[PDB]
Design an enzyme around this catalytic site. Sequence first.
Site, PDB file in Angstrom:
ATOM      1  N   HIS B  41       0.816  -1.211   0.000  1.00 22.63           N
ATOM      2  CA  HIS B  41       0.000   0.000   0.000  1.00 22.63           C
ATOM      3  C   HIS B  41       0.857   1.272   0.000  1.00 22.63           C
ATOM      4  O   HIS B  41       0.287   2.337  -0.106  1.00 22.63           O
ATOM      5  CB  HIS B  41      -1.025  -0.052   1.153  1.00 22.63           C
ATOM      6  CG  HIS B  41      -0.454   0.160   2.515  1.00 22.63           C
ATOM      7  ND1 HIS B  41      -0.306  -0.876   3.403  1.00 22.63           N
ATOM      8  CD2 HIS B  41      -0.099   1.291   3.182  1.00 22.63           C
ATOM      9  CE1 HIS B  41       0.161  -0.408   4.555  1.00 22.63           C
ATOM     10  NE2 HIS B  41       0.315   0.896   4.435  1.00 22.63           N
ATOM     11  N   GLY B 143       2.649   5.567   9.773  1.00 28.49           N
ATOM     12  CA  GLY B 143       4.016   5.520   9.322  1.00 28.49           C
ATOM     13  C   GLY B 143       4.789   4.322   9.820  1.00 28.49           C
ATOM     14  O   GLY B 143       5.927   4.120   9.380  1.00 28.49           O
ATOM     15  N   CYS B 145       3.960   1.285   9.180  1.00 30.31           N
ATOM     16  CA  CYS B 145       3.783   0.137   8.287  1.00 30.31           C
ATOM     17  C   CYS B 145       5.115  -0.306   7.717  1.00 30.31           C
ATOM     18  O   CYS B 145       5.995   0.522   7.428  1.00 30.31           O
ATOM     19  CB  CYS B 145       2.854   0.476   7.150  1.00 30.31           C
ATOM     20  SG  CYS B 145       1.255   0.979   7.835  1.00 30.31           S
TER      21      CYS B 145
HETATM   22  C1  LIG Z   1      -4.989   0.095   2.941  1.00 28.45           C
HETATM   23  C2  LIG Z   1      -4.585   0.114   4.208  1.00 28.45           C
HETATM   24  C3  LIG Z   1      -5.479  -0.109   5.396  1.00 28.45           C
HETATM   25  C4  LIG Z   1      -5.415   1.084   6.332  1.00 28.45           C
HETATM   26  N1  LIG Z   1      -4.027   1.404   6.675  1.00 28.45           N
HETATM   27  C5  LIG Z   1      -3.564   1.415   7.936  1.00 28.45           C
HETATM   28  O1  LIG Z   1      -4.293   1.156   8.875  1.00 28.45           O
HETATM   29  C6  LIG Z   1      -2.125   1.819   8.211  1.00 28.45           C
HETATM   30  N2  LIG Z   1      -1.835   1.774   9.631  1.00 28.45           N
HETATM   31  N3  LIG Z   1      -1.204   0.697  10.179  1.00 28.45           N
HETATM   32  N4  LIG Z   1      -1.076   0.913  11.459  1.00 28.45           N
HETATM   33  C7  LIG Z   1      -1.561   2.171  11.743  1.00 28.45           C
HETATM   34  C8  LIG Z   1      -1.630   2.871  12.956  1.00 28.45           C
HETATM   35  C9  LIG Z   1      -2.197   4.113  12.917  1.00 28.45           C
HETATM   36  C10 LIG Z   1      -2.684   4.671  11.731  1.00 28.45           C
HETATM   37  C11 LIG Z   1      -2.618   4.005  10.534  1.00 28.45           C
HETATM   38  C12 LIG Z   1      -2.028   2.738  10.573  1.00 28.45           C
HETATM   39  C13 LIG Z   1      -3.185   1.682   5.516  1.00 28.45           C
HETATM   40  C14 LIG Z   1      -3.186   0.464   4.622  1.00 28.45           C
END
Ligand SMILES: C=C1CCN(C(=O)Cn2nnc3ccccc32)CC1
Lengths: 305, 305
Positions: B41, B143, B145
């Site tokens: 993503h 961030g 990820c």
């Molecule tokens: C398409 C997708 C599904 C949604 N998404 C995420 O939730 C990414 N993410 N991961 N941990 C997180 C902690 C706080 C905020 C966002 C966060 C991005 C990828």
Amino acid sequence: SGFRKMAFPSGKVEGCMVQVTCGTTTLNGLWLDDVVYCPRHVICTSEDMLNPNYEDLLIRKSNHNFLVQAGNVQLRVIGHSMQNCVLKLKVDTANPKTPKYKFVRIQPGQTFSVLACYNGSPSGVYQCAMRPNFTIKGSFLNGSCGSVGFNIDYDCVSFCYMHHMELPTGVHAGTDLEGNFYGPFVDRQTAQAAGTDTTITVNVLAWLYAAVINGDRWFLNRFTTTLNDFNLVAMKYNYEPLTQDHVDILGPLSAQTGIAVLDMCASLKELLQNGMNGRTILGSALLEDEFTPFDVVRQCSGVTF
Amino acid sequence: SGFRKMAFPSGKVEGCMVQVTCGTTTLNGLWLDDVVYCPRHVICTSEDMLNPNYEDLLIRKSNHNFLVQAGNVQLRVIGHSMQNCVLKLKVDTANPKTPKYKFVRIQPGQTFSVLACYNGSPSGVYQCAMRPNFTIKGSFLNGSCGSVGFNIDYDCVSFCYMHHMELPTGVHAGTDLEGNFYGPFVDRQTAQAAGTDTTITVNVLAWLYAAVINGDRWFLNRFTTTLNDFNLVAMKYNYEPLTQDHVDILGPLSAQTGIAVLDMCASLKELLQNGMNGRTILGSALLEDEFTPFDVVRQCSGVTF
Ligand SMILES: C=C1CCN(C(=O)Cn2nnc3ccccc32)CC1
Ligand SMILES: C=C1CCN(C(=O)Cn2nnc3ccccc32)CC1
């Protein structure tokens, strides 16, 4: 979101760990620049342990009796000195992996990460707090002596703790990196009083703010209190007195959440008086005091090193 | 003695972390040999997030659109491929810091350490468990990820988890390093059912053994039970069924302590039915299920890497 008992990344400290052997005893040392630091009791034997005469024991030793090994590389010892309860072994090679570092003597109630090591090799890393009575509640087996505690700020490792001793109560005691014990303790195999511990009030409040930020909210109530009234409750439950300096260091968390510090104290008062009624906060069924206000802000804001 | 929620030393993983940027989005990647692994993503925008067409999005990208930076060194991308929910970016340089490593798909109930990173830089390390419902209860901000979970055996890092998503419930979901999600989850910004979780029974029993080894002993009772009777209790309290394979993996702890596994089950039965009456075990007022039997033996025996 989510809140975990997080330790600093240990890589910069791992590169500093060595094994030190003196006679029969092996423990860990910390190799920074051209000096290896380790607990002085590496020079004892079991006949020595009730009250070692460290000056007399060290006079029997020469540079070549301290065997220092970093992985498979043997270090050449070109000097040795005893400073308080630590030995400083001068070596002929500076550690190429030395990070930017400082030696710090921390205050009770502050937190740090421990890299537990055996034979100079890292086993695990965990976060803990220096108790108000200057003990730590660690996880240390025989041979872990010389493992160190530390914090990291940007690129700088602040070493604050070197492990020396497990008291007969099962709690742990150690020194700063100049070899001065935290607390009343001495490096002798004896029962030693630690004296009254208490809960670190400013840290519990920080963790209640962490809980609100993460959406555990059920303990917020309709009440407020005063610093005076709260401290009468804190005394009753063996909590540290809260000062305005503590209220000030909680300021950023109060601002983030909108909950005045004394309102959060009134929530804590109710939890102390009534318990948690079978409920949990951030996965815990007790009041957690091993996160400082700085820890909570760092973890909630993603600060890196 | 003492028992802590200990993570693996993170140094070998820290040397693998990089920043990957594709357009506006920055996240973390894992640089092993001449391949960087990261969540697919990274190629999305916010218009994309409810249901991205990843194949169509990736067809718009070329090697030179993936910016990969390791500290200050820029890596040259010479190929890219999507495997399940991960992107594999071939780079022209092998990581000189690559450890010995394996990719593993772990089973629910197993534990691992997470190195939380932002912008390719490590923030903290903590231990957690893969829940029976394949979520993890982490600490992840936007961030994070591409941060990874791992175990270490001797000199070998087994990577088992890459972080992708926070569900609207606040729990976390991710993939193995071939990009296959754990659990029913997809990389879309949507409510997604996780389904019933349970407590990891074999891990609670392991932790009760850890408690006895460390001298918390008060919950041992005069009773025993059968696997059948115990599992009727486990069902009532939403614990995982205990199997003979679990009894077998608890064998070493049973032998160390002298307490038969079914006797320890009878202590657990009484704790489930009666609670902990205001008492604590290893510093906890609930039953802890994030230590495996292997974790308990490792920590209690000082195994190093
Ligand atoms: C398409 C997708 C599904 C949604 N998404 C995420 O939730 C990414 N993410 N991961 N941990 C997180 C902690 C706080 C905020 C966002 C966060 C991005 C990828
Ligand atoms: C003269 C002394 C005082 C006694 N002593 C120690 O307790 C060393 N120690 N440190 N942590 C330990 C954990 C388990 C067993 C021993 C441990 C050696 C130095």
